[PDB]
Amino acid sequence: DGSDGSKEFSLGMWSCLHAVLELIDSQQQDRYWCPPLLHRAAIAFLHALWQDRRDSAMLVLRTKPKFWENLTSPLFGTLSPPSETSEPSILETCALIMKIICLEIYYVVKGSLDQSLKDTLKKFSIEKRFAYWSGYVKSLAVHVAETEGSSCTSLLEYQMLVSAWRMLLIIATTHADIMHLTDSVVRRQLFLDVLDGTKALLLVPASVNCLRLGSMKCTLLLILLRQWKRELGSVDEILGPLTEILEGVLQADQQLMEKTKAKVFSAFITVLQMKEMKVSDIPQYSQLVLNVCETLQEEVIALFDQTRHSLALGSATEDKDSMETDDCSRSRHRDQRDGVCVLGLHLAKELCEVDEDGDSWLQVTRRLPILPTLLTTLEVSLRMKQNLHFTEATLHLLLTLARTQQGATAVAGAGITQSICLPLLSVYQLSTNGTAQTPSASRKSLDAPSWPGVYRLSMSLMEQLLKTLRYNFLPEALDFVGVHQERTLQCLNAVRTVQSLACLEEADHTVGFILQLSNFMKEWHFHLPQLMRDIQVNLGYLCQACTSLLHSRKMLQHYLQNKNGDGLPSAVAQRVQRPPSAASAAPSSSKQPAADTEASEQQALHTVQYGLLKILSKTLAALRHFTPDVCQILLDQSLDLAEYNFLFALSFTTPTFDSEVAPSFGTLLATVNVALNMLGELDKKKEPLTQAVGLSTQAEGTRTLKSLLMFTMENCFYLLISQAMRYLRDPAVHPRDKQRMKQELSSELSTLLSSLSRYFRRGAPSSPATGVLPSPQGKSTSLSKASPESQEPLIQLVQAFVRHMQR
Amino acid sequence: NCERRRFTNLCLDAVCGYLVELQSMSSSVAVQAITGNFKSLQAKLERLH
Amino acid sequence: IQGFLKNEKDNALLSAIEESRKRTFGMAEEYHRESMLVEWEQVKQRIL
Secondary structure, three states: OOOOOOOOOOOOOOOOHHHHHHHOOHHHHOOOOOOHHHHHHHHHHHHHHHHOOOHHHHHHHHOOOOHHHHHOHHHHOOOOOOOOOOOHHHHHHHHHHHHHHHHHHHHOOOOOOOHHHHHHHHHHHHOOHHHHHHHHHHHHHHHHHOOEOEOOOOHHHHHHHHHHHHHHHHHHHHOOOOOOOOOHHHHHHHHHHHHHHHHHHHOOOOOHHHHHHHHHHHHHHHHHHHHOOOOOOOOHHHHHHHHHHHHHHOOOOHHHHHHHHHHHHHHHHHHHOOOOOOOOOOOOHHHHHHHHHHHHHHHHHHHHHHHHHOOOOOOOOOOOOOOOOOOOOOOOOOOOOOOHHHHHHHHHHHHOOOOOOOOOOHHHHOOOOHHHHHHHHHHHHHHHOOOHHHHHHHHHHHHHHOOOHHHHHHHHOOOHHHHHHOOHHHHHOOOOOOOOOOOOOOOOOOOOOOHHHHHHHHHHHHHHHHHHHHHHHHHHHHHHHHHOHHHHHHHHHHOOOOOOHHHHHHHHHHHHHHHHHHHHHHHHHHHOOOHHHHHHHHHHHHHHHHHHHHHOHHHHHHHHHOOOOOOOOOOOOOOOOOOOOOOOOOOOOOOOOOHHHHHHHHHHHHHHHHHHHHHHHHHHHHHHOOOOOHHHHHHOOOOOOOOOOOOOEOOOOOOOOOOOOOOEHHHHHHHHHHHHHHHHHHOOOOOOOOOOOOOOHHHHHHHHHHHHHHHHHHHHHHHHHHHHHHHHHOOOOOHHHHHHHHHHHHHHHHHHHHHHHHHHOOOOOOHHHHHHOOOOOOOEOOOEOOOOOOOOOHHHHHHHHHHHHOO | OOOHHHHHHHHHHHHHHHHHHHOOOOOOHHHHHHHHHHHHHHHHHOOOO | OHHHHHHHHHHHHHHHHHHHHHHHHHHHHHHHHHHHHHHHHHHHHHHO
């Protein structure tokens, strides 16, 4: 019994551990040679006590003087090489001591560990025993590749030392602070000894033992690679042995080596992700892309018929009880995120960002039937709502390829539109049998794989293919917009009700594809003379919705807040009257609210305001292609007006966020005032905070948001002038309200141009502004620099229109 | 197409190596001619890059 | 410790696929987002 209500345990007069503690004492091994098969047996008993969580014994060993010094003393010995006849009970002894160290550092979470152990791990690092045992578990893995096909007896003890060394090193990354493994040169040696020491076991494709040990070290290699992807300060030493490991792993059985092909592709993706690289660098790139695409043709065909046997074996059940542990025969679904198919697609999608002209990759895919092979499996996956990770990964590879003229023509010539257009209808289609909605939409990432994500990537792929191929993908884009016409019209409206960031990310691609397609207005009007006008109307309401939300920044904050907290119904209401007072009293306790809540709500609000601004910019450009150009409708009187709709109503009322309110010239005047106030906050946030490090991309976001804010204003002014001339010409628009239009726009374009000229006399981000900026340096004539007062074209064009309204 | 700009470096570096070797040799009419041939080759590779 | 070594293998497969998918989405959006502005500067320099 303890003074503090705890129980003490002690090694009593008949404890077995008194004899175990003598058998391992270095300071009696100075006197009585404990032969290694007996030291092994004493250490095996200590491994079981640490495995089988007998902590009432472990506590009573942790408290023994010299325990960790005597117990670890064989790890401070030296061994003969594997080519000399050492006693394998010593290899087991060292492997079992490594297991005890692993279990103790894992269970005794980062604090309560013994100080003689903490300074023993420190001693192991100072004596560089990491580098010694690294070199030994390297050479012992070459020796197995040199002695398989002989009756090499100690192979089980060799497997025990290789598995114990794997366990020790994954703890020496995650607990590097307790293992004292903080020398990046020793980490680089440990990585290369695990790389070479994996290669030797994977270049023997006939040896089940080498394949097993090499696949187990490949599990270590892949962890060390990711935890050290800042200290492996060269890439080009790693790619060679990974190609040699791949080409060995492709000469061996798929049913074992699935669980190695995946690890090797996962390593290659991680290595390509460390450095900006080109086809000039990579060892045998033209064979590596062959090896990867031929592996993908095992995988995508095995997935294709897996998705067809799931179409023949009808009405399996929701078999929901089985609390059972890691056994065989239960079937391998190939649509796993870490499956060889899905990792091969992502590796191909990294490698397609290294070959700039596509000229190296197309010299593989002119051999292999692979592009239509991917599309036929995608076509079934989309029809069945099966194979989500593969479906998304295939669309990622296609979206990478569609950027180059060689990749886009290869994707189009593979039949892309047929294998997506009708299958993709399934994805967003709902069942008409209405039942319960499951609220389990917990806070996962916006990059969690999803069926809406598959639709967004299909829209992004058609935005990309039409941007690259134009007239040579225009029928395909018209059939696609006509088939997807419901989802196109839904997503133009979804911003009116579902202001969530994942919905804004769908709407921007829908308006993006529309912005690529409205370049072909007369061709679109010939084939789809309904839908093009229904899109003009819904783009009009999307302009009203985005501008009223971006203006009403408090209503946007409230629409987020009122969809970020849940769970209480009540009704019936009625009224009125009064408190008060009072008691009382006491006591405690003190936590604070997190300012990180106001920071994260503001960061969500700034990202939602950026999403709404992208959509508004794309909408204002897409709508401009549905009006005659400002130059045409100013300068030619033979230009017809029946070819062009009224897209804005003759009001100057500011835009309400409001269900039926059609967009107006007051909506356009509000869009410019929104952009002026946002630009007018980006030149407030300029006070000198310091000592933060590591974020570059906020400089780029401060650039791209400012060029976007210009694009929102300037296409809005093009719509304003074009539609104002569309009203001022027209023979039915009443002369009273033509004169009203001249008057109310002559006032608010004058107030806006007075505000624009009060901004631009600071300089927009430009080469003239950068040339005017100097003062200690860079000056000529007296105090001038470059040349000043080159004006921006909007300030001339809106002047010319205001002058002509004042005629 | 992609190989060609890796190869013109390696060919210039190798031509420089062979020209260091040749310029250590006893300067016979053959060593003089081949030093001319490799510098004529250099003076074309200096346009292939 | 086996569940932890399962999880370390899982994160050592899973995470670079999300880094690759983040690269595709970012490099597609950034190419549409800047092309639209290089197209717009070609509009402004025509207006000038």
